[PDB]
Structure formats: structure tokens, C-alpha cells
């Protein structure tokens, strides 16, 4: 069953299975915590069941921010109404020694597995950097008297990861929907610790760095993020057809990048410089402003329905939007907002005013004298040279 997440590229090209495992790959600041927070915000509040956040080896500031954000949002209630809470946080963050980070994912799984097996209900299990479990076992295993495997890891990498990951499943008595961010080290998808984790997931969401350097957020690599749901007997026929058409247009653009690099767009044929324009349009249309990213971008977040993104990408695949500019597609929710932003961005190229309507000179009882304003400044005191000796000598 599909999980509508309200993100365009995720719901279109690699749709999450309700109950499946989800992996968010990407390395060192591409957005695999902002994406997992927006997944928490979209799926988790409209879920119905419980949530379990297992932070494994990530920032303690992030755990404090998540804890206070869930307190301010009613997902976590303190004290007398604590039974109404719907999230358990389990934290083995990156200041903990390697014995603790290697075993806190198992604590998160045990708190989730009591809900799945005994309580018998749907839960959501978000894990922040399941890579830190593998890396912590690599730090431990260097001292346990073992011969090291390939690039420096433990020999029991696949079996430790399989012992952890095979417990995160849906059974006939309950359901764990698991999203796990997976750090790739030094931007290498062929590193053995992500390349083993690839085989344990239904839906994969590979966040790339170059797509983030293009400004496109979420920086999902659309030809590297796959799913077991992208199948016409599962998601319907027209969703699957527009997904394959989007991926074909992006792949045809990707094969042209070296000749566009040296020879420019003035060398391609008409059929190629059409697909360059359409693929640059659908590159921008995969971007979307998140609700949790609005604190540092300003643009409010967009929940995009599945029908909205299927129809919106069907339009740009057919050719119904060839006369809109590229930056109309940048950071918009659905196909109405790109047209609204296009009409607004050709209004804003014609928004010209003459003599710029100041009314700034001689404002009758708006501005005081400057000395009246400096009179409003209360004066702070300078408290005698840091006083550091005496309040150290209190001890």
C-alpha cells in the first residue's frame, strides 16, 4: 500500500510502501535529516498509531530540537497527560562511546517491537543515521582481535546489519513503517556500509550533493532512488507511466551533459534541445519547499497530493507547459502554483513605479529628533573588569 508523503519526487518516482523499509541515503549535509523531519511532520501526525524515534549517533542539538518541537506540538505531553503522547525518543547520540551507539538502534527496535508484537498496531520507526550503528561496530571490532575486512570495516558487517534490519518488519500481527537515514561516507555509494544497507530496503531515496549544489531541495537523485512500489500493478498505470517518462527524460538529459558542457546548447538538434528544456523544467519541478525548512528559507511548506503531482508531471511530459519559464517551476507545490508564480514573475518583471511614492520627508508626528531617540536609550553598566577572580574564589 502506498504512503502519500506530500513530497513530489518521493511520491512520484520512489513511492514509500506503507509498512516497508525506507532508506534516505546521502552524505554530509545533503538534507537527510530535513527530509526525515518533513517525513515525521507529514506522515507521523496523520498516522493514527505510535511513533518511535531512535537517534543513533547524531547531533544532540538535533535531539533537543526534536524533543522541544514535539513538546510544543502535542506529540509529546509532559506530566499528567503523558498517556496522550504518541512518540518515544531513544537517544544514543554522537557524544556517546561506541558501545552505546552500536546498541541504541536495538533499543529503538525493542520499544517498537513491543508495540508491533504485543500491542499489535501500526508504528512508525524513524532512525537517524543507521550508519552510526555500523561505524560504531567498526570502532569496537578494531579492538576485539579481528582481521579487518574491506575498506577498513569489520568482517561481520553484513550479518550484524542483517541481525538488526531483519527485525524491522511488518508481520501478520503488526506493522512497522521504518524510515532510516543512511550516511554515505565521503559521498561514496560503493562504500560497503551503504552498499550493504541498499539490499535491506523497499524504497530507496538517494540524496545527491550536486543536486543540492544546484539549489534543488530535496536533492533526491531521481535516477538513483528506486522503489519496490514502482510497478503498474501496485500504483496504477498512469502514475507508473509518468514516473517512467520523467525518468526517461532525465536520463536523456544526463547523457547530453558532456556535449552540453564542451559545445553548449547551440549544437543539439531540435528534438534534443526540446528535451533539454523539458528536463530542466522537470528538474526544478522536483524541488519543493518543506514545512520544516521554512525556518531558514521563509517559503512556507507545500503538501502536494498524489493526484496533483501525477497530473502536474503528466502536463510537463506532454508539452502543455513549454511557454512557462524555468524558475516558475522552482520551489512550488503543484501545477497551479507554477502558473501563478509565472504570472507573478512576469508581473514582477513589469512592476515599475515612477518617483517611488516616498512620503518620507517631513513626517508630522512620526519621526522625533534623533536626540529624543537617544534619550530613550537606557544605559547599561560596565561591571568592573569581568569580576572573574572573586566568583572563582567562592569555591
Amino acid at each position: 500500500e502506498i504512503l502519500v508523503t506530500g513530497i513530489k519526487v518521493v511520491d512520484l518516482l520512489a513511492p514509500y510502501q506503507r509498512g516497508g523499509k525506507i532508506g534516505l541515503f546521502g552524505g554530509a549535509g545533503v538534507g537527510k535529516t530535513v527530509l526525515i523531519m518533513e517525513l515525521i511532520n507529514n506522515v507521523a501526525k496523520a498516522h493514527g498509531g505510535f511513533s518511535v524515534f531512535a537517534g543513533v549517533g547524531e547531533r544532540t542539538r538535533e535531539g533537543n530540537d526534536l524533543y522541544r518541537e514535539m513538546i510544543e506540538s502535542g506529540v509529546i505531553k509532559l506530566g499528567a497527560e503523558r498517556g496522550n503522547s504518541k512518540c518515544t525518543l531513544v537517544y544514543g547520540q554522537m557524544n556517546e562511546p561506541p558501545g552505546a551507539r552500536a546498541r541504541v538502534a536495538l533499543t529503538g527496535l525493542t520499544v517498537a517491537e513491543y508495540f508491533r508484537d504485543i500491542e499489535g498496531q501500526d508504528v512508525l520507526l524513524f532512525v537517524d543515521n543507521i550508519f552510526r550503528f555500523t561505524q560504531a561496530n567498526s570502532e569496537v571490532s578494531a579492538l576485539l582481535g579481528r582481521i579487518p575486512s574491506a575498506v577498513g570495516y569489520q568482517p561481520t558487517l553484513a550479518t550484524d546489519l542483517g541481525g538488526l534490519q531483519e527485525r524491522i518488519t511488518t508481520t501478520t500481527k503488526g506493522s512497522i513503517t521504518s524510515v532510516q537515514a543512511v550516511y554515505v561516507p565521503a559521498d561514496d555509494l560503493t562504500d560497503p556500509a551503504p552498499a550493504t544497507t541498499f539490499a535491506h530496503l523497499d524504497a530507496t531515496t538517494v540524496l545527491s550533493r550536486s543536486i543540492a549544489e544546484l539549489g534543488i531541495y530535496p536533492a533526491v537523485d531521481p535516477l538513483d532512488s528506486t522503489s519496490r512500489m514502482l510497478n503498474p500493478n501496485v500504483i496504477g498505470a498512469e502514475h507508473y507511466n509518468v514516473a517512467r517518462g520523467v525518468q526517461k527524460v532525465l536520463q536523456d538529459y544526463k547523457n547530453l551533459q558532456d556535449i552540453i558542457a564542451i559545445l553548449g546548447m547551440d549544437e543539439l538538434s531540435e528534438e534534443d534541445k526540446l528535451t533539454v528544456a523539458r528536463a530542466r523544467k522537470i528538474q526544478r519541478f522536483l524541488s519543493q519547499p518543506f514545512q520544516v525548512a521554512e525556518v531558514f528559507t521563509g517559503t512556507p511548506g507545500k503538501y502536494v497530493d498524489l493526484a496533483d503531482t501525477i497530473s502536474g508531471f503528466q502536463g510537463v511530459l506532454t508539452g502543455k507547459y513549454d511557454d512557462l519559464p524555468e524558475m516558475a517551476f522552482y520551489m512550488v507545490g503543484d501545477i497551479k502554483e507554477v502558473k501563478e508564480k509565472a504570472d507573478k514573475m512576469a508581473k514582477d518583471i513589469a512592476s515599475r513605479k515612477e518617483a517611488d511614492n516616498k512620503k518620507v520627508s517631513e513626517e508630522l508626528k512620526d519621526i522625533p529628533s534623533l536626540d529624543k531617540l537617544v534619550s530613550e536609550i537606557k544605559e547599561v553598566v560596565i561591571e568592573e573588569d569581568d569580576g572573574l577572580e572573586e566568583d572563582f574564589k567562592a569555591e
Binding site: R146, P155, L157, G162, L223, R228, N231, Q247, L256
Partner: protein, 351 residues
Amino acid sequence: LVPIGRGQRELIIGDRQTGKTAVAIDAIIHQKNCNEQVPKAQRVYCVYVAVGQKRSTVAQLVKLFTQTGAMRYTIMVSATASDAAPLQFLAPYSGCAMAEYFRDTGKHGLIIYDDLSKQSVAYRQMSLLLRRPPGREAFPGDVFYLHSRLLERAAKLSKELGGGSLTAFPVIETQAGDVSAYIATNVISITDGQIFLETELFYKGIRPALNVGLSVSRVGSAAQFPGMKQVAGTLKLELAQYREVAAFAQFGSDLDAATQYVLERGARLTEMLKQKQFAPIPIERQTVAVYAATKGFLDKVRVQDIVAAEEAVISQVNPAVFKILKANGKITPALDAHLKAELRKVKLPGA
């Protein structure tokens, strides 16, 4: 293009999410399809060995092999990822010993070692913890022998031993198309052919994502279906011409008409070999639909609807030709002029 005989070992090599398990599943489902139209000495009883996958993937595959009906011929050996490394080490030998029962009794088998690379990873763990000295990529010395003594058990036995066979389909996952890796070079040199699948052709719409230039089968046309053999060498030749006319098609102004015909014909042939998964076509409909495109019957049809044109050709010719091409075993001259003309009264999605 890459024909497979009963008794050889055909590697399925590619990157992740390219079609490897899909090609193996289509083979097992088509063995179920062929097992009902042949006598009991021609039936192929498949064995699926799943080393290192999740149990949810194995449950999806057992659900699929029950839904299609292929479970009554299939054995499913699954040492999964939570299972211990000696179990993932000894799972392909278990499945090969189960398939050797049908080989040694005159019947035919189809063993598919899914992710032989994960067997090699489990063996690497099992040997590194036994304090055996590692080598390249920390693999032991005898990891060539590990796969060679497993794959050489897939044999077509002689007539004095029942004449049975065993076809092996090892699946190898590579990292970013790197076949210069250790286990990949080992099992490439061990096996007969290779079905080399690419992820840059998988996303160009060409699915099953077979890289035709590198996918070979070293039995050649010795165990190709005649009739398919009569068009297949020309199919190889025309795709070979289309591949060497490529990397010049960015110049659409370059009107040649000596290269554009093969550049269009190769596009129709590339669009011809696309196929949905979980639906394997019988061999007679396949050779009829390649006889439809190698002769130029589809040359009027646009390149964006040959996947419907082939279904219309198969569904609008008589269902009486496939019955006699399945029995007669080659395109007889009492059939090539019948179905020259039966492909004239079919209507096409292309104008």
C-alpha cells in the same frame, strides 16, 4: 540475442535495481508456462536460491510463485540476511544438491543462485573470523574455487547417465558498473555467457536493461531456437550497426539517408526488445514478433508505439501459426509466405 541452452551457466550481472531478479523470475515463470505443453521428459523443475536477501523479499517471491502456479515445480532455498554466515555460505550448495537430483534422474533443472556476491561476502566473513589470511578486497585465496566448484555442477549429462541437465543462473551485483572487481571477474571467467544489465539503459526505458554489446552466450546459436535463429543473427547485426552509428545522433541536421535508415531501424529494434516484467512471452510469439521487425513490416510505425504495435501484431495474426511454429521448430517455407501475408491484414498503431 543471448540464447541459453539446457546445461550451461549464464551469469546475470549488473548494478542494483536493474532487472536481475526480474530476469530470473521471468525464467522460472516461463518454465511453468512451458512445462504444461511438453511431455514429462522435457519439464524443467526450477530451484531458487536466495542468499542474503530479506525475508520479505523471499515472501514476495513465494507469493508470486504461488500466484502464478510455479511453486509446484520450484524449490525455494533461502538463507536470508539474519541467518548466520555459514548458512549463507552453504545455501547455494544446498540448492545445487537439490537441483542435482533432477539432473541425475534424467530430468532438467534450473538453479538460480541469487546474489552469489552475498555468498562470497558470507564466506569472507566466515574465513576472516577463522584467522585465514585475507587477500584482494579481504577475500580469501579460495574464493575462485568457492564459485567454480559450485558452478561446474551445472552440467548436461551424457545419454549413459540419463541425459539430464542443469542450467545455472548466478546473479552478481556490481558497484557502478565495475566488472573489474574481484568476484565479478571470477564468476565472469567461470560461467559461459553473461547477461550484463545496465542502469543507464534501465532508465532510458529499455527494460529488460540488457547491454547487447557486452551480453554474450558462448554456446552461440547451437542451442538457439531455429526460426528465432533465422532472424536473430540479423537482429545482432542490425543492433551492432545501430550501436556504431550512435554517438553521432546529436547532429540532427546531418541528413545522410545512408545512416538514418539504420538509425531508425535500430530504434525500432531497441523498442522491440522492451518487455514488461512478470509476463514472459512464449518463444513462438517472440520469433513471430522479431520476424515482424527484422523485415521492415513496422517501418511505418512511430518509435513511441511499437510496444503496442507488437501486441497488436501478436493479437491480430491467426492463433493457428504459433501452433505450427511451436511444432515445426523452424520458419518453414510453407509458413514464411503465409505469415508474410498474415502480417499484411493486421492493422497497426502507426501512420
